Design a protein around this ligand. Sequence first.
Ligand SMILES: [Cl-]
Ligand SMILES: [Mg+2]
Lengths: 244, 111, 241, 243, 244, 233, 224, 242, 250
Amino acid sequence: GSRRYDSRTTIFSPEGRLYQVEYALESISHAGTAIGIMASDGIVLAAERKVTSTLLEQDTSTEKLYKLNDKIAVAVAGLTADAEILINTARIHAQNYLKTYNEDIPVEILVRRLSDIKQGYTQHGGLRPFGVSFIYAGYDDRYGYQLYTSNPSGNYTGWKAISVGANTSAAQTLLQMDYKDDMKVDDAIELALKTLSKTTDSSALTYDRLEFATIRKGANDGEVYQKIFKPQEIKDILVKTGIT
Amino acid sequence: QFNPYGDNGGTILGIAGEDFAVLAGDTRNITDYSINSRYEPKVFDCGDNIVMSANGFAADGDALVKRFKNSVKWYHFDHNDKKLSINSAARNIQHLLYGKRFFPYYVHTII
Amino acid sequence: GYDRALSIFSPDGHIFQVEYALEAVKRGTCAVGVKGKNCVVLGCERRSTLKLQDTRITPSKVSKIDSHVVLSFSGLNADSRILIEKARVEAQSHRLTLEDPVTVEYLTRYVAGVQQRYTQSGGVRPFGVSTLIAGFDPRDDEPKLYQTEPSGIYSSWSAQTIGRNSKTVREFLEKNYDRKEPPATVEECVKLTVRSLLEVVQTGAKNIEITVVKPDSDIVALSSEEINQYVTQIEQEKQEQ
Amino acid sequence: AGYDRHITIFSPEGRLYQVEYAFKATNQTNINSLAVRGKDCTVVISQKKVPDKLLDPTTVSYIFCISRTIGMVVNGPIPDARNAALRAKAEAAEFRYKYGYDMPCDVLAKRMANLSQIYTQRAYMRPLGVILTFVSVDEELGPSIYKTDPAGYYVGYKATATGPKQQEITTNLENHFKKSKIDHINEESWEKVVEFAITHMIDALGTEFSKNDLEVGVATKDKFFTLSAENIEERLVAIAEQD
Amino acid sequence: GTGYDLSNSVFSPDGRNFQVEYAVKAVENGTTSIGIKCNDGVVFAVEKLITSKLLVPQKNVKIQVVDRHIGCVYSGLIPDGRHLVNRGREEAASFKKLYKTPIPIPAFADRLGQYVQAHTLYNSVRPFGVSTIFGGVDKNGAHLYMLEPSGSYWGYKGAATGKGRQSAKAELEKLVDHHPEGLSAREAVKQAAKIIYLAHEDNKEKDFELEISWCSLSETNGLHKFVKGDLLQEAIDFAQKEIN
Amino acid sequence: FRNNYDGDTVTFSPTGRLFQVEYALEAIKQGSVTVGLRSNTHAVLVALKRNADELSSYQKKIIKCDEHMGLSLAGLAPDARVLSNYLRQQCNYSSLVFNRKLAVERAGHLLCDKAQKNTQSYGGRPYGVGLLIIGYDKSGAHLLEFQPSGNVTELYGTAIGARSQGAKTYLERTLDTFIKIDGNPDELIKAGVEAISQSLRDESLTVDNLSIAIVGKDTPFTIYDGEAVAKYI
Amino acid sequence: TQQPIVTGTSVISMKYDNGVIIAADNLGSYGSLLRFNGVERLIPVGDNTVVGISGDISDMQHIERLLKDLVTENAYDNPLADAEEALEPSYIFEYLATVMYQRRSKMNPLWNAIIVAGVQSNGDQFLRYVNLLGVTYSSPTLATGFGAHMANPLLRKVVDRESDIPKTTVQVAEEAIVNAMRVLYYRDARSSRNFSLAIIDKNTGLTFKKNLQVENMKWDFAKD
Amino acid sequence: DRGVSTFSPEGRLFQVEYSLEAIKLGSTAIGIATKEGVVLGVEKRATSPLLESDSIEKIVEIDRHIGCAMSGLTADARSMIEHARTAAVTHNLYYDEDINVESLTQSVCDLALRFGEGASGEERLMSRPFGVALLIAGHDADDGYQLFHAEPSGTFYRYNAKAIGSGSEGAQAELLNEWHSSLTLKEAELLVLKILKQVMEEKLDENNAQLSCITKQDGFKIYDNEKTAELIKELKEKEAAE
Amino acid sequence: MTDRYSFSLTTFSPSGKLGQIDYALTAVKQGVTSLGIKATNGVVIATEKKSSSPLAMSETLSKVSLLTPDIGAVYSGMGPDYRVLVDKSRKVAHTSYKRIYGEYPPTKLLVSEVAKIMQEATQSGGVRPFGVSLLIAGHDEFNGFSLYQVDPSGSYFPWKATAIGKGSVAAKTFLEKRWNDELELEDAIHIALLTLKESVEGEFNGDTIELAIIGDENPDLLGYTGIPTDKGPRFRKLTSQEINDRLEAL
Ligand SMILES: [Cl-]
Ligand SMILES: [Mg+2]
């Protein structure tokens, strides 16, 4: 029968590793780097567009930064198509929480739910894992500004600063060397770009190869703003931090 | 509208001696004011020295007797030709009847 | 749909999927429980492959099942979450039908029965997890500590450790735990837990977390300074020789 | 690493060997067929080979009456052919019932092609080892030939040919449509379109035909039907009084 | 490479299905059975090998009846043949339930044909290990069929399958040539006994038991019946005479 | 060769064989011998029961299906329980629905079709047991032989299991004698004991070793074990 | 739950020394309209059983097909289908009794009263009744609908108990059935002059008589 | 790979034979039937000294007149006990009587061959055979005191005495000589305690071995450690006596 | 019977490659060239009709397809896979959008629903990915004119212009030279015809070239009058003639 053609995607190696999860993490290591940095007064998400062209329309384009809520967002690393399946279920989980409780979903509860869906693909069903690693940047009134990470295993963790995809070893060393706890958002913007500018496998780091997002409050509001940077704004900040 | 129940009349009588028992019943089956039969047996030897009658609606009575006789046959098969004690037959019939609690067998039964 | 038998017998009589699940546990960070006369203490090491973590939000290693029972583990973190949820739901269901919190043995038996089922059900692999389950039965003061492993076997321990270098820290507890005289205080029970981890953790102020559980749903997690004090006092014991 | 040749998954060259091998099955029967369009008719000629003397000639056919208007000639093994026939008939009857008009030739073709394309993507189904040639006089498009293969491909033909000696017949017809400058046999009666079909099948194969060597189908406005041995023998007699 | 013959629904590089070809070997290994189409009916005959004196004479019947008007005999895996006749019986009942008329033999032939072909479409089933010879009398005359493990069937004047098929086909071919006007039902029965005796020289080591049935418009009223007693003996003698 | 085409029951070998079925057939031969034989008035089962230790019981070989039918097994007992279970329900259905005792011929046909379903579908496994079914119906005494291939045969006599060829050859020789033991159950059983003792080698059949069953004209299917089979050793 | 549409009235029957007689008229009524007049309500099954059906005729026709399907099915892999393993009246009855009780129990009855009349293989007389409720009974005389009220009283003056059956001849029984059919035409407002009658004798076999008529009627006294 | 309900060319199911290997790697269990009751004994076999021995439960109550000992993958037994208990209680709810020991055993064994990937029979959803053999001891009116061996092959034997697990072939050969039809319950107890002593790698005390019995009068009782202690003392004294 | 292929046929390899997606993109490369160019006031999509026989009628095979009255699709690769993708794309535009909001989906959202269908073929039990790359061109009121590419992975990207299939590397280079943000729709068609000429071996006329635009509203293609708010479809397939006229100014 069919037995002959089954890859068996949900078994252990003799070492007790999950083959398909290990190979998916391998896939993701080739993907455009994404960096999250949490400050005292906000969060920063930066990501390197993998492969471009003079003809790729960048104004209409979104391959790495997605809004999950008005308070939550994700940086993606890996298969885009896989990410969009997970992103769409997460957007719905948030709206179910809001309908049931009449409160916006806590960031950890959304993250745990996605992470549990990914775990499922690891343990039953015999389908390939989602070849995706997420950085979540959210805000809620319990834990304030939060930054989490999730990978094909279904494992999630919380960070002050993190990278996924290409050159995470290099990126994590550099972040850990120049990150202080009393940092301001404007400083985190600068740190995030420098780290990308040093791990890039490309000649330079131009505006047409970057996605950028921030989650800043207002003293003149008391509510939280998600600003996904438009190409011209990424070009402006790129000069201000001294990369022209 | 269709009425799934009817009434075939008859009467049955069970008396227990010290070392014996009897189960009796008239042999007359009726519908309204008509006689259907003057000799329609109603009391049955079920094996294992147990006799049974289920008086009232004949169709529901013959069904129950059939299901119980079959219950005796499958007890022999499942419990190495063990004899079905009367107390055990009784509990088995409680389950047969209660099985149809919400569409009952219209019978009064004696064993 | 997918019902392929993933856990099967090999010719020598082993179940390789179950065997390999244990290897995932062996890879997992160390966890240890020691039971006092009047308390139980759960210790867990924290990794150092990456360190830039938010310790406020990162899911901690010791999970409450009910107000009186805790679960720690060693193995796949994601697999742990599925067991913890099922148990928390079994905890509320037990209270609803019996009108009484679970015993520690009951909760353990339920977690071990689930772990087992995943070893003879089509389409699934076993849990890559072992658990310590510690607490106090309702209206009882006599401490309980239990261990489960992916096979679905469980048993109660005076003291036990699971995960990477558990061999070493077991050897320590075997020759430092007196059944005649269990750690009489909370303080000296915690100290025997830290001492046991210090064999494996290698200088870990922020690389050890301790949870103390006492009778009548009295559970608390120690902070970095409370644990750091214990590390300080145990290093002076050595140097005073 | 060698199982990409057993089920309908991609080889490293982007190819589906199970589809390519299914096309190889089509020629197993060693039968050639050609369809041509008239002014207001459509004609399918197929070779009829009966090797065994114990066979009932009458029961040996690869032409099927799908509906009152649609006819289908199959190049491939008869079991897959009859599978395709029954499905096409079932589909034809359900279209009429649900939408109130006779299923057109080209729409039926698309539907059987979509069914073939599915065996090309789902692993538990093998492709059918057959090439389905569909003919009618459509009430909108007029005389129509639509052909499907194991790949799920289909297209309309001015005329077409199928089988081992496909190419000989094809280049014969190709030359005739360069000469005549039109895209149908300019003939009023089907009788003289059936004579055209048989004539060009003899010149392309270089073989003569008796009345039991051929199998003929005709679509007219509002009926598709097959010819008896006796209707063909009449047809052979007329081409003979010309050569 | 190879492995083209391990999985049922799979095409070899030359367009063949080896699993169907291997089922044909199970059939050829089988006992010899024949059908003969007479001028108003059909005759079925089959060789029954006597393993030992312990087999009860006449009692292990191989020829099976469908509806009341159809006969089936088969060569190969006997339980496979039974499984097909149960499907045959469900199919003929279904047809009669809706259309009132008993199923025409061509209609019934395709019903078997489509089922057997269904069993070459999937690797989760095995092909049938029988070639079936079946027919009877309908609205417009007698019909004889044979059905291969591939699903292939045609109408026949005569048919044979299994051990003795070459001896039988040879003897059937002579009858078709020597009787262009047609054979009678009485004659076809005798002729069928002879062809089974002559085709039993391919198996001559073990003793055997002849079994014949017929469906004739004139002789059995278009119903399937078994040949028994005197008419069976007349036919045994006709073969025992002509074998010498 | 064989190794490639014996993985499952859904696969034919290049010679047209079903190896999973031929392996199932091997489970019978490794099983303890049993014998059936009949006259016009009675059918008998004689079986040799097999114990693990001298501390263990001898595994029961004969199962009753109805008052007029039952069978002896050789091979996997848990499969013999499944098929005898199924056959009990066919005998039961015939009675409750048609008030008719199931024909022994028809019992055969129903077992055959159940066996066959396991040998053409993926994931299934053939049955691993052989059965000798005896009954008295409206056409008298019957003895069937069931193979897990699906093949069911009606015989005057036969044997299956280990060294079963000894009893089978004896029966094949005695045929004219035992077929005529009508209205004498004792002499038919003696004839069937003599048969089974043609398949001994190891030991000599004893009181807690021999099982016999009989059915006939005015004899419901009944099983004799222990002291009850003393008078036949 | 249904309501009967086209209907057949009384079925009457009794036993005698060597077999059984059954009769029923040839009418399908449509309420008060006497709509169809050729209707056969006696179903022969083999040559040892007749089944007489009253009630809904759509349901009767369905029960007629169930019995032809039973004959076909019994011949399958059965070389004794015309001897020892032929269908018995008691096999046919128990099958119908089962179907009837199953249908009432699913609240979707076959709206019929049925009388199975035959001889068993051992020479014994078989006569038994079942209806849309799954109620069953034997008696030396059985009738449905009106036949219950008027035919049983007349037929019971010939066979009152079992001991009377061997004293009753075919002629005596047949006359009794023919007179009961007349009396029913007199008094049943949904009855027909035309009727079929079947005899099953354990010697002469099955005799089926079509196109019979009520004769020797008394209307002459009406003029005064 | 190869199917889970595949036959070997010798006529054996692969997965059942490999299972039988798992049961040899298990702790020892001994049953001895007598006319005064049935005795069940087990090697506890704690993997560390920090393990609280009396949390090792390898002898369990099924009903008051039925208990069982296990050897093999003991986690595999949990669902088999839950089915036996349910069977015994369900039997009592339907027939107002105790289930026979033999019928209870038959019921446990009916599970054992319900494994496959969708086997053409019923709905056997369960990936592999059980990796544990059971000794099932009990009393009923009909056949008296009984010991049964319940394997994953779906067969059960009735034994006068039986050993299963690591020490089995050795212990069975010992039971072969020692057992006679007129053993007292006290003799049966010592004989179990003795044969455990011989085959256990550890030195036998009241913490790494457990005794139980089933008598018509008091039903199935697990002996607590103090009573087993005094039977170990009694054994030692009789063996030093010659 | 019963699909027993409940497991992925597309799995990660030790390198982190998805074999079947890689192999599907190989199949796309072998397929005929198609392209798309965005202008200020329209979009054009273009491909070669590679007739499989001169006896075939290339008019009875469309490689360019209307999905909604304002959205059109073309492909490179396996035509049967495109055909059933167009069936499913038309139907999801109704079930997931029109039967809820009473308007046609905007381009980016219909593209998203196609991507989703193709992503599923990459992960579902018992299927192979689709062997096509689509170019989807469309207009919606709030986003204006747009052009998307959709790959077997289910990944989609917005383009000012691009090409796929055989000669796509060359063709992309030729479009990067010629394109600007000030192109009128007529200039974009012109560039498309030049670019496609470098890909076509033989005959290059309006019988061997299939070309369509998302342009102005065509009220003459609506089929009714009276309702002012309805101005008619923006998708228009160019005629054999309309192509040949622009080839005489080439
Ligand atoms: Cl379709
Ligand atoms: Mg396929």
